[PDB]
Design a protein around this ligand. Structure first.
Ligand SMILES: Nc1nc2c(ncn2[C@@H]2O[C@H](COP(=O)(O)OP(=O)(O)OP(O)(O)=S)[C@@H](O)[C@H]2O)c(=O)[nH]1
Lengths: 334, 13
Protein backbone atom coordinates (compact mmCIF):
# COMPACT_ATOMS: atom_id res chain seq x y z
CA UNK A 1 0.00 0.00 0.00
CA UNK A 2 1.63 3.21 -1.20
CA UNK A 3 1.02 5.99 1.30
CA UNK A 4 1.65 9.64 2.23
CA UNK A 5 2.48 10.45 5.84
CA UNK A 6 1.55 13.70 7.57
CA UNK A 7 2.82 14.12 11.12
CA UNK A 8 0.99 16.65 13.28
CA UNK A 9 2.68 17.79 16.46
CA UNK A 10 5.85 16.51 18.06
CA UNK A 11 5.05 12.82 18.55
CA UNK A 12 3.43 12.65 15.11
CA UNK A 13 6.50 14.04 13.37
CA UNK A 14 8.74 11.65 15.26
CA UNK A 15 6.66 8.57 14.42
CA UNK A 16 6.20 9.72 10.81
CA UNK A 17 9.99 10.06 10.51
CA UNK A 18 10.60 6.58 11.94
CA UNK A 19 8.11 4.99 9.51
CA UNK A 20 9.66 6.78 6.52
CA UNK A 21 13.10 5.80 7.77
CA UNK A 22 12.04 2.14 8.00
CA UNK A 23 10.56 2.25 4.49
CA UNK A 24 13.73 3.85 3.08
CA UNK A 25 16.29 1.58 4.74
CA UNK A 26 14.45 -1.59 3.69
CA UNK A 27 13.91 -0.20 0.21
CA UNK A 28 10.20 -1.11 0.19
CA UNK A 29 9.23 2.31 -1.22
CA UNK A 30 5.71 2.25 0.23
CA UNK A 31 6.04 5.72 1.73
CA UNK A 32 5.78 8.11 -1.19
CA UNK A 33 6.34 11.18 0.95
CA UNK A 34 6.33 12.41 4.54
CA UNK A 35 5.62 15.87 5.93
CA UNK A 36 5.60 17.11 9.52
CA UNK A 37 3.36 19.95 10.65
CA UNK A 38 3.86 21.69 14.01
CA UNK A 39 3.63 24.97 15.92
CA UNK A 40 6.87 24.42 17.80
CA UNK A 41 9.79 25.42 15.57
CA UNK A 42 12.46 23.44 17.45
CA UNK A 43 10.56 20.16 16.94
CA UNK A 44 10.62 20.60 13.20
CA UNK A 45 14.28 21.48 12.90
CA UNK A 46 15.47 18.04 14.00
CA UNK A 47 13.33 16.01 11.60
CA UNK A 48 14.65 14.62 8.28
CA UNK A 49 11.28 15.04 6.54
CA UNK A 50 9.72 18.09 4.89
CA UNK A 51 8.45 20.43 7.61
CA UNK A 52 5.65 23.01 7.81
CA UNK A 53 5.50 25.54 10.63
CA UNK A 54 2.06 26.97 11.33
CA UNK A 55 0.60 29.35 13.89
CA UNK A 56 3.49 31.81 14.37
CA UNK A 57 1.04 34.71 14.41
CA UNK A 58 -0.58 33.12 17.49
CA UNK A 59 2.15 31.24 19.41
CA UNK A 60 5.45 32.46 17.92
CA UNK A 61 6.95 29.05 17.06
CA UNK A 62 6.77 27.77 20.65
CA UNK A 63 3.91 25.24 20.56
CA UNK A 64 0.44 25.44 22.11
CA UNK A 65 1.33 23.88 25.47
CA UNK A 66 -1.31 21.17 25.57
CA UNK A 67 -4.12 23.53 24.60
CA UNK A 68 -6.27 21.35 22.34
CA UNK A 69 -8.60 24.16 21.24
CA UNK A 70 -5.68 26.38 20.24
CA UNK A 71 -4.23 23.39 18.37
CA UNK A 72 -7.44 23.06 16.38
CA UNK A 73 -7.84 26.81 15.61
CA UNK A 74 -4.32 27.13 14.22
CA UNK A 75 -4.84 24.15 11.91
CA UNK A 76 -8.13 25.72 10.76
CA UNK A 77 -6.50 29.06 9.91
CA UNK A 78 -3.40 27.58 8.35
CA UNK A 79 -4.69 24.42 6.64
CA UNK A 80 -4.21 25.83 3.11
CA UNK A 81 -0.45 26.08 3.74
CA UNK A 82 -0.60 22.51 5.06
CA UNK A 83 -2.67 21.20 2.10
CA UNK A 84 -0.25 22.98 -0.25
CA UNK A 85 2.72 21.09 1.12
CA UNK A 86 0.74 18.03 -0.01
CA UNK A 87 0.08 19.29 -3.54
CA UNK A 88 3.23 17.85 -5.09
CA UNK A 89 3.38 15.11 -2.47
CA UNK A 90 0.03 13.29 -2.46
CA UNK A 91 0.73 12.09 -5.97
CA UNK A 92 -1.55 9.97 -8.14
CA UNK A 93 0.17 6.83 -6.96
CA UNK A 94 -0.99 7.34 -3.36
CA UNK A 95 -3.31 4.59 -2.14
CA UNK A 96 -3.99 6.07 1.27
CA UNK A 97 -3.02 8.96 3.56
CA UNK A 98 -1.96 8.57 7.20
CA UNK A 99 -2.35 11.51 9.58
CA UNK A 100 0.09 10.60 12.37
CA UNK A 101 -0.54 12.17 15.81
CA UNK A 102 -0.06 11.95 19.54
CA UNK A 103 -3.65 12.23 20.74
CA UNK A 104 -2.75 13.63 24.19
CA UNK A 105 -0.81 16.71 23.07
CA UNK A 106 -2.15 20.09 22.02
CA UNK A 107 -1.11 20.34 18.37
CA UNK A 108 -1.71 16.77 17.23
CA UNK A 109 -4.77 16.43 19.42
CA UNK A 110 -6.32 19.62 18.07
CA UNK A 111 -5.00 19.60 14.52
CA UNK A 112 -5.26 15.91 13.61
CA UNK A 113 -9.06 15.73 13.38
CA UNK A 114 -9.16 19.03 11.51
CA UNK A 115 -6.63 17.89 8.91
CA UNK A 116 -8.22 14.42 8.67
CA UNK A 117 -11.65 15.93 8.04
CA UNK A 118 -10.21 18.32 5.46
CA UNK A 119 -8.38 15.56 3.54
CA UNK A 120 -11.24 13.08 3.70
CA UNK A 121 -13.44 15.64 1.97
CA UNK A 122 -11.36 15.94 -1.19
CA UNK A 123 -9.13 12.93 -1.88
CA UNK A 124 -10.58 9.65 -3.13
CA UNK A 125 -8.23 7.43 -1.11
CA UNK A 126 -8.82 6.51 2.52
CA UNK A 127 -7.56 8.93 5.15
CA UNK A 128 -6.34 7.06 8.24
CA UNK A 129 -5.17 8.44 11.55
CA UNK A 130 -2.23 6.69 13.17
CA UNK A 131 -3.01 7.81 16.70
CA UNK A 132 -0.83 7.55 19.82
CA UNK A 133 -2.70 6.91 23.06
CA UNK A 134 -1.07 8.43 26.16
CA UNK A 135 0.20 6.13 28.86
CA UNK A 136 -2.10 5.69 31.84
CA UNK A 137 0.36 7.55 34.11
CA UNK A 138 0.20 10.72 31.97
CA UNK A 139 -1.54 13.81 33.33
CA UNK A 140 -5.30 14.31 33.32
CA UNK A 141 -4.86 17.10 30.75
CA UNK A 142 -3.38 14.62 28.29
CA UNK A 143 -6.04 12.01 29.02
CA UNK A 144 -8.75 14.63 28.32
CA UNK A 145 -7.06 15.85 25.11
CA UNK A 146 -6.80 12.26 23.90
CA UNK A 147 -10.36 11.42 24.91
CA UNK A 148 -11.84 14.23 22.84
CA UNK A 149 -9.36 13.77 20.00
CA UNK A 150 -10.01 10.00 19.77
CA UNK A 151 -13.74 10.65 19.71
CA UNK A 152 -13.39 13.18 16.90
CA UNK A 153 -10.98 11.27 14.67
CA UNK A 154 -13.07 8.10 15.00
CA UNK A 155 -15.87 10.00 13.25
CA UNK A 156 -13.88 12.01 10.71
CA UNK A 157 -11.20 9.52 9.64
CA UNK A 158 -11.76 6.36 7.61
CA UNK A 159 -10.10 4.53 10.47
CA UNK A 160 -7.96 5.18 13.51
CA UNK A 161 -5.08 2.75 14.01
CA UNK A 162 -4.18 3.09 17.70
CA UNK A 163 -0.81 2.78 19.37
CA UNK A 164 -0.86 2.39 23.14
CA UNK A 165 2.42 3.77 24.55
CA UNK A 166 1.90 1.63 27.63
CA UNK A 167 1.98 -1.46 25.36
CA UNK A 168 5.65 -0.87 24.56
CA UNK A 169 7.83 -0.74 27.67
CA UNK A 170 11.26 -2.09 28.53
CA UNK A 171 12.62 -2.10 32.07
CA UNK A 172 15.37 0.43 32.72
CA UNK A 173 14.89 2.46 29.55
CA UNK A 174 15.55 6.19 29.44
CA UNK A 175 12.69 8.52 28.54
CA UNK A 176 13.94 9.21 25.03
CA UNK A 177 14.92 5.56 24.42
CA UNK A 178 11.41 4.55 25.40
CA UNK A 179 9.85 6.86 22.83
CA UNK A 180 12.31 5.86 20.12
CA UNK A 181 11.74 2.16 20.94
CA UNK A 182 7.99 2.63 20.63
CA UNK A 183 8.32 4.51 17.38
CA UNK A 184 10.66 1.89 15.96
CA UNK A 185 8.39 -1.03 16.86
CA UNK A 186 5.45 0.77 15.33
CA UNK A 187 7.45 1.61 12.25
CA UNK A 188 8.39 -2.05 11.66
CA UNK A 189 4.79 -3.22 12.13
CA UNK A 190 3.19 -0.55 9.95
CA UNK A 191 6.00 -0.58 7.39
CA UNK A 192 5.64 -4.34 6.86
CA UNK A 193 1.89 -3.92 6.50
CA UNK A 194 2.48 -1.24 3.88
CA UNK A 195 5.22 -3.25 2.18
CA UNK A 196 3.19 -6.48 1.80
CA UNK A 197 1.16 -4.87 -0.99
CA UNK A 198 4.28 -3.87 -2.90
CA UNK A 199 5.62 -7.40 -3.44
CA UNK A 200 1.50 -11.40 -2.25
CA UNK A 201 -1.18 -9.52 -0.30
CA UNK A 202 -3.16 -7.05 -2.44
CA UNK A 203 -3.36 -3.51 -1.06
CA UNK A 204 -7.13 -3.88 -1.33
CA UNK A 205 -7.09 -6.43 1.54
CA UNK A 206 -5.79 -3.68 3.84
CA UNK A 207 -8.38 -1.21 2.55
CA UNK A 208 -11.26 -3.64 2.96
CA UNK A 209 -10.11 -4.58 6.45
CA UNK A 210 -10.13 -0.91 7.55
CA UNK A 211 -13.28 -0.11 5.53
CA UNK A 212 -15.59 -0.72 8.49
CA UNK A 213 -14.12 2.31 10.28
CA UNK A 214 -13.52 3.16 13.92
CA UNK A 215 -10.60 1.86 15.94
CA UNK A 216 -8.02 -0.49 14.48
CA UNK A 217 -5.12 -2.42 15.97
CA UNK A 218 -2.05 -4.02 14.49
CA UNK A 219 -0.59 -7.19 15.94
CA UNK A 220 2.90 -8.58 15.45
CA UNK A 221 4.89 -11.62 16.63
CA UNK A 222 7.76 -13.69 15.22
CA UNK A 223 9.58 -16.99 15.65
CA UNK A 224 12.62 -18.75 14.29
CA UNK A 225 11.82 -20.72 11.14
CA UNK A 226 12.94 -24.21 10.38
CA UNK A 227 13.94 -24.75 6.72
CA UNK A 228 11.29 -27.48 6.68
CA UNK A 229 7.78 -26.02 6.40
CA UNK A 230 6.23 -28.96 8.30
CA UNK A 231 8.29 -28.07 11.41
CA UNK A 232 6.80 -24.58 11.41
CA UNK A 233 3.13 -25.44 11.77
CA UNK A 234 3.20 -24.72 15.52
CA UNK A 235 5.27 -21.57 14.95
CA UNK A 236 2.55 -20.17 12.63
CA UNK A 237 -0.21 -20.99 15.14
CA UNK A 238 1.60 -19.47 18.07
CA UNK A 239 2.91 -16.29 16.40
CA UNK A 240 -0.64 -15.71 15.14
CA UNK A 241 -2.09 -16.22 18.64
CA UNK A 242 0.53 -13.92 20.15
CA UNK A 243 -0.02 -11.25 17.49
CA UNK A 244 -3.74 -11.19 18.31
CA UNK A 245 -3.49 -11.61 22.11
CA UNK A 246 -0.19 -10.10 23.34
CA UNK A 247 1.52 -8.41 20.41
CA UNK A 248 -1.16 -5.91 19.48
CA UNK A 249 -0.54 -2.15 19.25
CA UNK A 250 -3.71 -1.66 21.33
CA UNK A 251 -4.25 -4.19 24.20
CA UNK A 252 -7.39 -6.37 24.28
CA UNK A 253 -8.29 -5.78 20.61
CA UNK A 254 -9.63 -9.28 19.78
CA UNK A 255 -13.29 -8.37 19.36
CA UNK A 256 -13.08 -6.98 15.83
CA UNK A 257 -15.34 -6.56 12.83
CA UNK A 258 -12.62 -7.40 10.30
CA UNK A 259 -9.15 -8.85 10.26
CA UNK A 260 -6.23 -9.38 7.93
CA UNK A 261 -3.78 -12.17 8.65
CA UNK A 262 -0.41 -11.91 7.00
CA UNK A 263 2.17 -14.62 7.55
CA UNK A 264 5.58 -13.35 6.51
CA UNK A 265 8.76 -15.29 5.77
CA UNK A 266 10.46 -17.45 3.18
CA UNK A 267 7.85 -19.25 0.98
CA UNK A 268 9.41 -22.72 1.41
CA UNK A 269 9.16 -22.48 5.22
CA UNK A 270 5.49 -21.45 5.44
CA UNK A 271 3.28 -24.56 5.85
CA UNK A 272 -0.12 -24.83 4.18
CA UNK A 273 -1.80 -26.41 7.19
CA UNK A 274 -0.24 -23.87 9.54
CA UNK A 275 -1.59 -20.90 7.60
CA UNK A 276 -5.05 -22.41 7.07
CA UNK A 277 -5.46 -23.31 10.73
CA UNK A 278 -4.03 -19.95 11.88
CA UNK A 279 -6.55 -17.97 9.84
CA UNK A 280 -9.37 -20.22 11.02
CA UNK A 281 -8.27 -19.63 14.61
CA UNK A 282 -8.37 -15.83 14.07
CA UNK A 283 -11.92 -16.21 12.75
CA UNK A 284 -12.96 -18.17 15.87
CA UNK A 285 -11.22 -15.79 18.26
CA UNK A 286 -12.49 -12.50 16.77
CA UNK A 287 -15.99 -13.65 15.82
CA UNK A 288 -15.41 -11.70 12.60
CA UNK A 289 -17.19 -12.74 9.38
CA UNK A 290 -14.54 -10.85 7.38
CA UNK A 291 -11.19 -12.48 8.05
CA UNK A 292 -8.88 -12.09 5.07
CA UNK A 293 -5.44 -13.59 4.66
CA UNK A 294 -2.32 -13.55 2.54
CA UNK A 295 1.38 -14.31 2.65
CA UNK A 296 4.31 -11.90 2.42
CA UNK A 297 7.35 -13.66 0.90
CA UNK A 298 10.59 -12.14 2.22
CA UNK A 299 14.17 -13.11 3.09
CA UNK A 300 14.43 -13.98 6.78
CA UNK A 301 15.51 -16.73 9.15
CA UNK A 302 12.18 -16.26 10.86
CA UNK A 303 8.42 -16.32 10.34
CA UNK A 304 5.97 -13.74 11.57
CA UNK A 305 2.26 -13.13 11.76
CA UNK A 306 1.15 -9.58 11.17
CA UNK A 307 -2.53 -9.20 12.01
CA UNK A 308 -4.54 -6.05 11.28
CA UNK A 309 -7.80 -5.82 13.22
CA UNK A 310 -10.39 -3.37 11.97
CA UNK A 311 -13.44 -2.12 13.85
CA UNK A 312 -12.14 -3.04 17.29
CA UNK A 313 -14.65 -3.04 20.14
CA UNK A 314 -15.12 -3.84 23.84
CA UNK A 315 -11.41 -3.32 24.55
CA UNK A 316 -10.73 -3.05 28.29
CA UNK A 317 -7.92 -0.58 27.64
CA UNK A 318 -10.09 1.70 25.47
CA UNK A 319 -12.99 1.55 27.91
CA UNK A 320 -10.67 2.14 30.85
CA UNK A 321 -9.06 5.02 28.95
CA UNK A 322 -12.39 6.74 28.18
CA UNK A 323 -13.60 6.17 31.75
CA UNK A 324 -10.72 8.02 33.40
CA UNK A 325 -10.88 10.78 30.82
CA UNK A 326 -14.54 11.43 31.62
CA UNK A 327 -13.71 11.39 35.31
CA UNK A 328 -11.01 14.01 34.79
CA UNK A 329 -13.49 16.26 32.96
CA UNK A 330 -16.18 15.81 35.62
CA UNK A 331 -13.61 16.68 38.28
CA UNK A 332 -12.37 19.59 36.17
CA UNK A 333 -15.81 21.11 35.55
CA UNK A 334 -16.11 21.75 39.29
CA UNK B 1 10.88 -12.84 -2.76
CA UNK B 2 12.07 -9.61 -1.14
CA UNK B 3 15.80 -10.11 -0.62
CA UNK B 4 17.62 -8.49 2.29
CA UNK B 5 20.83 -6.55 1.88
CA UNK B 6 22.46 -5.90 5.28
CA UNK B 7 22.84 -8.45 8.07
CA UNK B 8 19.82 -7.46 10.15
CA UNK B 9 16.79 -9.75 9.88
CA UNK B 10 13.64 -7.83 8.93
CA UNK B 11 11.66 -9.98 11.35
CA UNK B 12 14.41 -9.89 14.01
CA UNK B 13 13.98 -8.69 17.61
N1 LIG C 1 5.02 6.91 20.57
C1 LIG C 1 5.50 8.26 20.89
N2 LIG C 1 4.76 9.04 21.70
C2 LIG C 1 5.22 10.31 22.01
C3 LIG C 1 6.42 10.75 21.47
N3 LIG C 1 6.63 12.03 21.92
C4 LIG C 1 5.59 12.37 22.71
N4 LIG C 1 4.74 11.34 22.78
C5 LIG C 1 3.47 11.31 23.48
O1 LIG C 1 2.55 12.15 22.73
C6 LIG C 1 1.82 12.92 23.63
C7 LIG C 1 2.19 14.34 23.49
O2 LIG C 1 2.11 14.78 22.18
P1 LIG C 1 3.08 15.83 21.57
O3 LIG C 1 3.16 15.49 20.11
O4 LIG C 1 4.46 15.70 22.16
O5 LIG C 1 2.42 17.23 21.88
P2 LIG C 1 2.13 18.37 20.85
O6 LIG C 1 0.92 18.00 19.99
O7 LIG C 1 3.32 18.47 19.93
O8 LIG C 1 1.78 19.74 21.60
P3 LIG C 1 2.14 20.14 23.11
O9 LIG C 1 3.67 20.39 23.24
O10 LIG C 1 1.34 21.36 23.34
S1 LIG C 1 1.54 18.80 24.57
C8 LIG C 1 2.13 12.39 24.97
O11 LIG C 1 1.23 11.38 25.20
C9 LIG C 1 3.47 11.83 24.84
O12 LIG C 1 3.62 10.77 25.72
C10 LIG C 1 7.16 9.90 20.61
O13 LIG C 1 8.37 10.29 20.05
N5 LIG C 1 6.67 8.66 20.35
Amino acid sequence: MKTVLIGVGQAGGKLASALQSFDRQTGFGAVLDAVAVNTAKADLQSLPVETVLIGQDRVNGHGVGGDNELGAAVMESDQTEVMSALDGRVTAEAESIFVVAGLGGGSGSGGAPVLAKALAGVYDVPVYVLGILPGADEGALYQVNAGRSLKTVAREADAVLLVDNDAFRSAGESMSEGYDAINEAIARRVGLLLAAGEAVVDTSEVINTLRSGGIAALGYASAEASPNAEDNINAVMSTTRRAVLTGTSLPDASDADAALVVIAGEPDTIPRKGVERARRWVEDETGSMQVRGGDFPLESGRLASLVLLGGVERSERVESFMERAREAIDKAET
Amino acid sequence: MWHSDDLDDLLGS
